[PDB]
Design a protein around this nucleic acid. Structure first.
Ligand SMILES: [Zn+2]
Ligand SMILES: [Zn+2]
Ligand SMILES: [Zn+2]
Lengths: 62, 113, 428, 34, 290, 239, 198
DNA sequence: ACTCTACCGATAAGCACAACTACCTCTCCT
RNA sequence: UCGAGAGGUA
DNA sequence: TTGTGCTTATCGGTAGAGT
């Protein structure tokens, strides 16, 4: 649950993520796709929910 | 501003003065009744300056001015130049004496002139 | 009925321009004390006792004395006989549009229709003047338009009602004109025109211009809006909105900012951005709008312990708190706490309408009861009978069962301030 | 593209010594709705 | 503008005395600040006392003003001083109170024969009695209560009616710099706000007339009105232009942006081509073209 | 924070700093003419009464505008030190600190609101309610709180809201704190003052359009070759 | 009446300073006169008569200006007529009038009607309390002569109309007694500017 | 000494515009 | 298409 | 809803002019 006024603490989220076998801070080691080298800093990745707005490029073309 | 009702018809009394009587009297216009006045006081009001009702909060009337601040003086306990100066009388001294209050939040030092 | 406190400008010289109390009833501009003595009062002391200021202020006493003097000067010997009644009748007849009824009948029905007795409305006027004087002295706060305690909302019961009324009036005018044209020189169906109201409603719905609440002309806009079909959320939030009408948009006041009265009724975090910022408010999830109750709660109130209002103005109210129902002084209560507790207990047992606000304020020493429509309500758990829930026999309780058993109740905005509310179960 | 409304009928009597007045639009899923 | 803010700077000779600037500013504020008689008085009542026809007919309604000595000590005032101030204010205008009033006498008494209340024992009483020229037109109480009492309260015991409020402020970049000596640590100037009740007389000229006893204390070489419109009429178009440039620089600095000096100078020289700072409306442009 | 203990230490430090800032504001509020007898170096027996009335200071601050401004200035001055704790409790590799020091985006105060505490929340316009100094569930139920119309200390008509939020965005906000934040930030979404810059720009352009520099070196107006400036008053460097 | 005496002393000192700035050959003793010396020389009661003096231009003795102090305030047209007759008898083309209060409309019409024959200036006592010229905001003002004005017009090849304007009612213009059609030279703390009296 | 007009300074009382730029859809009629 | 009223973009 | 002019109306108001 992600109820606004009943949100879980950050510690609980970190513990749940740690129990999943990943870093507790939400960042994972990534490797550059162009060269294959390992990046020095971990990159935060997560499945957020996104929305597509009704505004389009071709609708604004004049 | 003193309103009283006569014992006969319970109507408001109007103060009046008679030269021959040389005394304060009250007589209402409803019945021909006159009573002896007491305390010889026809008006008594505590002086107040609250003439702007429900308006002193929205508009800053500046009823209590802020004390001035100077940067010429230098505090003793701390090397801070800002202080609050004002004039006040001592516990038993006669006259006005200049006082100083340090503006440093961590100092809290006050001294005389 | 309007009572205005202002400096006298009629038959007043330069020296005497102090504030006096005036009554604006049917555009007559009558002195307050003449009206007091007309409503079954024969003593200045009794009238002073009716206006129970219970304070020592020089300005209030000066205003009262000035009002007495103005009443005495305007009408000679008004206390004796019925000269005040004749004066007020003459003032009413002096209006450009005087009522057809006589003075003996206008005062009964055009002045405080709720109070049948002629002496009770005098006491109500005294209470009104007392409230005005307390507000002037600063002891009582003035009503604010931003607060929802003093506001009501109408969606379809009243917005369409005035359009129906005005179109029916226009149809009646057309029908009587046609009948007068035809009589001097036909089925009843031909006399009445059916297209009038239909076309009027169609034009009102299409153009979006709705009839002004207080003005015959200058139709208001923004009442009717189009639905959004982009996603179900848009059409869900469009149906649940509240509009605040303001003459101008740039200069409005404090109506654009959230208020503590918005707690739980309308969302304070989501408002449209732009010209109508804060004027349009989205209703909360637990948001209900009260409706008019067919049943009358006057009879049930006397059973709880409320006593009738004293008809005689001579009898004073020592400690009896005032009971007001929809702005009408229905009666009195000896002790407000027990009366309110018993009324709430009766409401929780489904013996009273489920949409009713019971307000008890010790500052004004009165009990305020509302049962009209337009009030915003939300359900709140009641911890007094919360232990009754733990039966363990049933599951999936319907909301009607919970309301009947008193586990949950509908609380108005005015009533919520009186009670103490817990945010979470863990805190409880 | 027509109005979803309902007719109103009231009886009128004229004395000398059910007619149609208008159609009111109907809200969806009201008390009177199919 | 009704407020008509002013700006007064202290003279340099006060620097010789220890803490001279603070004492000078406090004295100027004390002398120039308006103090209403209503604030000083606490209880005002009208007592009925027989006239006894001593030498001149007078109303049998004396005004008793009770003032605590603590307030007088705080405000550095005496009963004789406030009585003299009230008499001076009454004789200064005497345009109000359009009644049969000839002369007004004010008497100071420490202890009064009033048995109505004795809550305060260290409060003096001021007696004000009106005198009528052998007439009974003043015998009524309503006229006295409605006219005389408000007039006495509105009369200032200290300062002048024109000056509304005076506050002492510290600044580091004054609009009017010193001649040559530059302490640069800052100066303690006084900002004076006046009343725009009537535009009959100039506020600056009225302020000059009030500061006659303390002309030496105020450094008139740097003092100037805060307004831009009348600063041209007081000290010339160039002084108004300089003050306008300073205010524009201050506004730009407050905005947080950096603007070159030439732009502001050109704006100032363009808005005062005709020698008068016209408004930004179409009326000002039309007047400038005319 | 490096670990949970560092987070607890930071939370306690922020709480103590906020308490100290509140006390500093209360001390600064006394700089008025009504307390000149108390501020002087004498013998006063009302020293305890000045510190016993803690809730009255908030009510006095909300009613008075000068007191509100003084309290805001004192709170900012005291809260600079509280904001300074981020460098002590922040790692060098922190992205927020890097972006704040580089100046690309954000500042120290935004990071403080992100992690430590939102801080002072005040509104310029006058309102009918006031924040009851605590922003808790118990405060919202107090009949004598400024939020419930007036405190009865005779009634009040307008207020200058003044509230301090101890919680941060990361830790979450209780509904009262969210209400306070929404009241404070509602002024930004308004459409006011959006036409004033445009109108001022148009009028200033109408006034300054005709000005141009002449071949002779003078600054002349287009209408009648009116002399605005004999020479350009720029401090160089190219003519 | 000591306040009136010191007020008159300040007014006289400011008037002498203005005359010296205008070049009327003011003696150094008058400029450096102290308050004690002023009250000793004036006497017990001046009656607003000792201040009335006559001064002549330093360069040319023919030009002369007379300062007039009326005995009473709210002056009328009779005193204006008497002053004009006195000026005609004494053959003086300029005068300075210092009045406690503002002039009557008839007096203003009379003083404006005879402006062509003789030039008269009116100064309020409140204005002369503080010397406007000796101010930090006010820059240096230098009045250009006819030859200087002609050279200025010829150098920039600009008409007198196409110049920044200064109204006659400006305090500096009245302080320097400048008539319409005269340009000024202003030095700012350098770049100089010129203003045309209109 | 003792009286009529007449241009002139300060408060009411109505007009009279104007409250941003570039954009894009949708319904209503016109 | 010529207009009006709404809803949105930067 | 106002900010800013803007233009009469209107209240004395006293200055000359006269007797
Ligand atoms: Zn009686
Ligand atoms: Zn210190
Ligand atoms: Zn007394």
């Amino acid at each position: 649950h992600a109820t606004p006024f009943s949100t879980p603490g950050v510690t609980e989220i970190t513990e749940q993520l740690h129990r999943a076998g990943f870093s507790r801070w939400g960042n994972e080691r990534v490797y550059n796709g162009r060269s294959g080298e390992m990046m020095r800093s971990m990159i935060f990745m997560g499945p957020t929910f996104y929305q597509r707005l009704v505004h389009m490029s071709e609708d604004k073309v004049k | 501003s003193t309103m009283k009702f006569c014992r006969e018809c319970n109507n408001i009394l109007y103060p009046k003065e008679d030269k021959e009587q040389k005394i304060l009297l009250y007589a209402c216009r409803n019945c021909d009744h006159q009573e002896v006045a007491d305390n010889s006081c026809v008006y008594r009001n505590e002086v107040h300056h609250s003439v702007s009702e429900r308006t002193q909060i929205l508009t800053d009337v500046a009823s209590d001015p802020t004390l001035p601040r100077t940067k010429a003086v230098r505090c003793s306990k701390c090397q801070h130049r800002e202080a609050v100066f004002f004039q006040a009388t001592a516990r038993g001294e006669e006259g006005m004496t200049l006082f100083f209050v340090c503006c440093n939040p961590n100092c809290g030092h006050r001294w005389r002139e | 009925f309007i009572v205005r406190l202002s400096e006298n400008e009629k038959a007043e010289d330069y020296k005497r321009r102090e504030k006096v109390l005036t009554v604006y009833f049917l555009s007559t501009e009558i002195p307050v004390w003449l009206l007091f003595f007309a409503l079954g009062v024969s003593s200045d002391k009794e009238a002073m006792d009716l206006i129970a200021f219970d304070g020592d202020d020089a300005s209030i006493t000066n205003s009262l004395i000035a009002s007495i003097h103005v009443a005495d000067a305007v009408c000679e010997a008004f206390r004796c006989g019925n000269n005040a009644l004749t004066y007020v009748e003459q003032q009413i007849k002096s209006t450009k549009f005087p009522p057809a009824e006589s003075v003996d009948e206008c005062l009964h029905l055009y002045l405080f229709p709720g109070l049948q007795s002629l002496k009770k409305k005098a006491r109500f006027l005294g209470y009104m003047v007392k409230c005005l004087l307390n507000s002037y002295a600063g002891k009582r706060k003035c009503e604010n338009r931003d607060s929802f305690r003093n506001k009501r909302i109408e969606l379809a019961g009243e917005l369409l009602e005035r359009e129906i009324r005005v179109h029916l009036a226009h149809a009646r005018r057309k029908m009587t004109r046609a009948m007068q044209k035809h009589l001097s020189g036909k089925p009843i169906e031909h006399y009445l025109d059916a297209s009038v109201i239909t076309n009027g409603l169609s034009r009102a719905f299409s153009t979006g211009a709705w009839s002004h609440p207080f003005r015959k002309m200058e139709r208001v806009s923004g009442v009717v809006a189009n639905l959004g079909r982009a996603n179900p959320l848009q059409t869900l939030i469009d149906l649940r909105r509240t509009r605040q009408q303001v003459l101008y948009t740039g200069k409005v006041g404090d109506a654009r900012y959230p208020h503590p009265s918005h707690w739980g009724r309308v969302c304070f975090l989501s408002t449209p951005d732009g010209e109508n910022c804060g004027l349009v408010k989205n209703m909360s999830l637990l948001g209900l709008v009260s409706t008019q109750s067919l049943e009358s709660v006057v009879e049930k109130l006397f059973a709880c312990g409320m006593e009738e209002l004293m008809d005689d103005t001579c009898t004073p109210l020592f400690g009896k708190h005032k009971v007001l129902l929809n702005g009408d002084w229905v009666g009195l209560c000896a002790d407000s706490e027990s009366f309110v507790a018993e009324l709430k207990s009766r409401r929780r047992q489904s013996e009273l309408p489920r949409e009713m606000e019971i307000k008890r304020d010790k500052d004004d020493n009165e009990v305020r009861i509302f049962t009209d429509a337009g009030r915003l309500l939300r359900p709140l758990l009641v911890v007094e009978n919360l232990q009754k829930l733990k039966q363990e026999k049933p599951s999936q309780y319907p909301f009607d069962h919970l309301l009947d058993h008193g586990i949950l109740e509908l609380i108005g905005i005015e009533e919520e301030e009186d009670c103490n509310t817990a945010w979470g179960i863990k805190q409880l | 593209n027509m109005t979803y409304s309902a007719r109103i009928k009231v009886n009128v009597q004229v004395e000398v010594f059910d007619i149609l007045i208008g159609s009111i639009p109907v809200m969806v899923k009201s008390i009177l709705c199919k | 503008q009704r407020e008509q803010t002013m700006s007064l700077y202290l003279s340099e000779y006060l620097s010789k005395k220890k803490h001279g600037f603070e004492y000078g500013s406090l004295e100027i504020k004390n002398h120039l600040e308006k103090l209403s008689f209503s604030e000083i008085v606490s209880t005002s009542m009208i007592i009925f006392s027989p006239s006894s026809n001593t030498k001149v007919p007078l109303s049998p309604w004396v005004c008793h003003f009770h003032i605590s000595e603590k307030v007088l000590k705080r405000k550095q005032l005496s009963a004789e001083s406030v009585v003299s101030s009230l008499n001076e204010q009454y004789k200064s205008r005497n345009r109000e109170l359009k009644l049969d009033i000839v002369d007004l006498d004010i008497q100071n008494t420490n202890h009064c024969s009033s048995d109505d209340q004795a809550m305060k024992d260290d409060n003096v009483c001021i007696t004000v009695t009106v005198v009528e020229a052998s007439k009974h037109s003043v015998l009524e109480l309503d006229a006295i209560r409605l006219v005389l009492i408000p007039f006495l309260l509105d009369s200032p015991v200290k300062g002048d009616q024109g000056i509304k409020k005076v506050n002492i402020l510290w600044t580091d970049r004054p609009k009017a710099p010193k001649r040559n000596g530059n302490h640069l640590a800052g100066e303690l100037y006084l900002k004076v706000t006046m009343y725009g009740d009537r535009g009959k007389r100039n506020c600056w000229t009225a302020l000059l007339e009030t500061c006659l006893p303390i002309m030496d204390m105020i450094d008139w070489g740097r003092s100037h009105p805060d307004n831009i419109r009348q600063c041209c009429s007081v000290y010339g178009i160039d002084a108004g232009r300089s003050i306008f440039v300073a205010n524009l620089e201050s506004a730009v600095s407050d905005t947080g942006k950096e603007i070159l000096r030439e732009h502001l100078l050109l704006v100032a020289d363009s808005l005062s081509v005709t020698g008068e700072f016209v408004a930004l409306n179409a009326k000002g442009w039309s007047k400038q073209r005319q | 924070s490096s670990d949970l203990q560092s987070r607890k230490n930071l939370t306690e430090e922020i709480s103590y700093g906020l308490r100290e800032a509140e006390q500093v504001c209360n001390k600064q509020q006394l700089m008025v003419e009504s307390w000149r007898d108390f501020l002087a170096v004498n013998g006063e027996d009302k020293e305890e009464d000045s510190v016993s009335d803690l809730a009255r200071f908030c009510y006095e601050r909300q009613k008075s505008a000068t007191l509100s401004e003084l309290a805001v200035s004192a709170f900012k001055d005291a809260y600079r030190d509280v904001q300074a704790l981020a460098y002590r409790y922040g790692d060098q590799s922190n992205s927020f600190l890097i972006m704040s020091k580089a100046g690309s985006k954000g500042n120290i105060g935004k990071l403080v609101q992100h992690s430590m505490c939102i801080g002072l929340q005040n509104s310029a316009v006058s309102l009918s309610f006031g924040f009851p100094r605590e922003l808790t569930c118990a405060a919202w139920n107090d009949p004598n709180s400024p939020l419930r119309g007036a405190k009865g200390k005779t009634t009040t008509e307008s207020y200058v809201p003044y509230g301090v939020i101890e919680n941060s965005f990361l830790t979450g906000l209780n509904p009262l704190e969210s209400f306070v934040h929404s009241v404070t930030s509602r002024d930004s979404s308004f459409s006011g003052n959006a036409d004033l810059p445009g109108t001022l720009s148009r009028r200033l352009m109408f006034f300054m359009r005709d000005i141009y520099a002449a071949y002779d070196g003078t600054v002349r107006n287009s209408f009648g070759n009116q002399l605005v400036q004999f020479t350009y008053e720029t401090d160089g460097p190219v003519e | 009446t000591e306040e009136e005496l010191k007020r008159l002393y300040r007014i006289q000192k400011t008037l002498m300073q203005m005359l010296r700035d205008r070049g009327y050959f003011i003696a150094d003793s008058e400029l450096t006169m102290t308050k004690q010396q002023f009250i000793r020389k004036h006497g017990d009661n001046m009656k607003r008569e000792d201040l009335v003096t006559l001064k002549a231009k330093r360069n040319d003795n023919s030009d002369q200006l007379y300062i007039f102090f009326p005995d009473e305030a709210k002056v009328g047209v009779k005193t204006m007529k008497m002053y004009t007759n006195r000026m005609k008898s004494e053959n003086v083309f300029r005068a300075i009038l210092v009045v406690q209060q503002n002039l009557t409309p008839f007096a203003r019409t009379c003083i404006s009607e005879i402006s062509s024959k003789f030039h008269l200036e009116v100064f309020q006592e409140a204005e002369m309390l503080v010397n406007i010229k000796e101010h930090v905001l006010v820059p240096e003002h230098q009045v250009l002569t006819t030859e200087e004005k002609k050279t200025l017009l010829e150098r920039y090849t600009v008409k007198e109309t196409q110049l920044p304007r200064i109204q006659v009612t400006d305090p500096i213009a009245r302080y320097f007694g400048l008539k319409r059609g005269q340009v000024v030279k202003i030095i700012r703390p350098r770049y100089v500017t010129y203003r045309y009296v209109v």
